[PDB]
Design a protein around this ligand. Structure first.
Ligand SMILES: [Hg+2]
Length: 72
């Protein structure tokens, strides 16, 4: 119950929304670590699948308002 994947959130592309995706995986649930890229719409996060999951990661940014995807 501890996986780490990357995320593709083209929902935006500047110093403000992609970084929000970082706040999304950090607020997704079991996220244990996060490291994305602003304008480079790319979030790489680690977490505990016991309470979260690669799906919940793309869903956290998708919930921030940035319909993204995942590609561990
Ligand atoms: Hg932005």
């Amino acid at each position: 119950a501890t996986q780490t994947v990357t995320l593709a959130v083209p929902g935006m592309t500047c110093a403000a929304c992609p970084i929000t995706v970082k706040k999304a995986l950090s607020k997704v649930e079991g996220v244990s670590k996060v490291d994305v890229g602003f304008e480079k719409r790319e979030a790489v996060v680690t977490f505990d699948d016991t309470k979260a999951s690669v799906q919940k990661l793309t869903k956290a940014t998708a919930d921030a308002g940035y319909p993204s995807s995942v590609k561990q």
